[PDB]
Design a protein around this ligand. Structure first.
Ligand SMILES: CC(C)N1CCN(c2nc(Nc3ccc4[nH]ccc4c3)nc3c2CCCC3)CC1
Length: 470
């Protein structure tokens, strides 16, 4: 900084392309280590394993987002390329010293091994360790990928690196092999259906408290298992979505099925009094969702009542008692003005909770369309890494809620019930949508002043048992 030291002697870029001089044609920074704006994947690998210092934020973000610009096998081969560093060509005077014998190696070569080769190779081992610790799904999906890595680390010689090599193997071994309650969870609630009679489970026969409890437990596990990589690059809306985003797709599809299920229960309840009781039950489920801070569950219900087939059922909503109507309307207002009220309430609740997942998926899609994958250059175009960082910022917001277990006991039969809901049946989404609205027109025809009379579907009481535990 206040004096320029002797430069480090490096091998030729014809035998080690990672030493090619930095320029605006292969790497750009954002105008405290510098923030990388983009570059070639070679230059990103170099800064990923830079010899001058460590960069833990770049390593984490790279390993979460790299799949949007580089293949897992491509990355392993790049790290092995980085590791096998040739030494500079010895000078004529250096060769003479070796020939003489019993001569300490050149000061330049000692500097090179100590200030470059060793630090770079250690940064690579650090990358391998972060990879298998936090992204081991790359190795579950690709078996040749793992065997290559394990083959390579077994080729590493040197006492100074054996601690690292054995730490990587210890992590892999822990991975390859892979409920307590601090205070007693409340007793399971049952209504008309009884334990074991899973064939009779339905919206009005299960207990409303337990429906909310069990959906919260299910939606909590689904939310917890989403990995940030499943959201980068909108890979869940792309060709290999089933492989790259399995947990995220299970979260979206649960939400789709449960929202269509609530709609189905309202419209298919043709008797007017029975239908008002169904809607009131769903609002009771909504209130326990809010008591449990399950905003995903809340907004799935808001989503159902906003569907056209339900929204038009004016005589049903008008028959609702004023109190349950007010609860529902407060919930609906959470979503208004781009979820303005929802966002201030999320920031003020204590764990455990289940956030609304749709706001992340929507905000990520806008970043995807609002930032180009590349930066434009005369020659080769650079990878836009700032874009990946921006998406990584949002995926970090998802992870801060995923370590919050609920103090609720799992009911296995009800758990299978909600995992196996198939409201559409054999119809397509299009076919089912038309069928719902057609059934809505039937149960409350246009411009009717009194809902038509339909026979009651069940013989049991419409009275809810309420949301008060016993
Ligand atoms: C006429 C047309 C606009 N209808 C009205 C009924 N309706 C809803 N009403 C209400 N609230 C409510 C109900 C009855 C009331 N009676 C006096 C005030 C009052 C307020 N909330 C919602 C929906 C739809 C689902 C989202 C939540 C659907 C649209």
């Amino acid at each position: 900084l206040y004096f320029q030291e002797q430069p480090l002697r490096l091998p030729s870029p014809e035998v080690y392309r990672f030493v090619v001089k930095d320029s605006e044609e292969n790497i750009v920074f954002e105008d405290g280590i510098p923030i990388i704006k983009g570059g070639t994947v070679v230059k990103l690998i170099e800064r990923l394993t830079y010899h001058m210092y460590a960069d833990p934020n770049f390593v984490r973000t790279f390993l979460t987002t790299y799949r949007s610009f580089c293949k897992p096998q491509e990355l392993l081969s790049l790290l092995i390329e980085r590791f096998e560093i040739p030494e500079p060509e010895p000078t004529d005077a250096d060769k003479l010293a070796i020939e003489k014998g019993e001569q300490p190696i050149s000061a330049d070569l000692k500097r090179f091994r100590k200030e470059y080769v060793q630090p770079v190779q250690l940064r690579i081992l650090n990358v391998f360790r972060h990879w298998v610790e936090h992204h081991f799904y790359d190795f579950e999906r690709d078996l040749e990928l793992l065997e290559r890595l394990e083959s390579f680390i077994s080729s590493v010689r040197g006492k100074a690196m054996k601690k690292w090599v054995e730490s990587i193997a210890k992590i892999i071994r822990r991975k390859k092999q892979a409920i307590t309650f601090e205070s007693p969870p409340p007793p399971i609630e049952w209504h008309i259906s009884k334990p074991g009679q899973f064939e009779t489970f339905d919206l009005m026969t299960l207990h409303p408290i337990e429906i909310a409890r069990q959906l919260t437990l299910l939606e909590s596990d689904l939310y917890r298992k989403v990995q940030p990589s499943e959201l980068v690059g909108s890979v869940w809306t792309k060709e290999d979505k089933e492989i790259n985003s399995p947990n995220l797709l299970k979260m979206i599809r649960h939400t789709t099925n449960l929202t269509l299920w609530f709609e189905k229960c309202i419209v298919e309840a043709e008797n007017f009094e029975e239908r008002v009781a169904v809607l009131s039950r769903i609002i009771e489920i909504l209130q326990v969702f809010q008591d449990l801070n399950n905003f995903n569950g809340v907004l799935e219900i808001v989503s159902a009542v906003n569907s056209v087939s339900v929204y038009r059922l004016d005589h049903t909503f008008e028959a609702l008692q004023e109190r349950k109507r007010k609860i529902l309307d407060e919930a609906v207002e959470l979503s208004q003005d781009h979820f303005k009220k929802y966002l201030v309430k999320l920031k003020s609740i204590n764990p455990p909770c289940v956030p609304f997942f749709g706001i992340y998926l929507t905000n990520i899609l806008k970043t995807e369309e609002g930032n180009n994958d590349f930066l434009k250059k005369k020659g080769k175009d650079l990878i836009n890494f700032s874009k990946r960082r921006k998406v990584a910022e949002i995926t970090g917001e998802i992870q801060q809620y995923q370590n919050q277990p609920y103090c609720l006991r799992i009911e296995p039969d009800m758990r299978r019930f909600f995992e196996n809901l198939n409201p559409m049946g054999s119809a397509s989404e299009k076919e089912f949508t038309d069928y719902l609205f057609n059934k809505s027109l039937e149960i409350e025809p246009r411009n009717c002043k009194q809902p038509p009379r339909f026979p009651r579907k069940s013989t049991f009481s419409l009275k809810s048992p309420g949301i008060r535990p016993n």
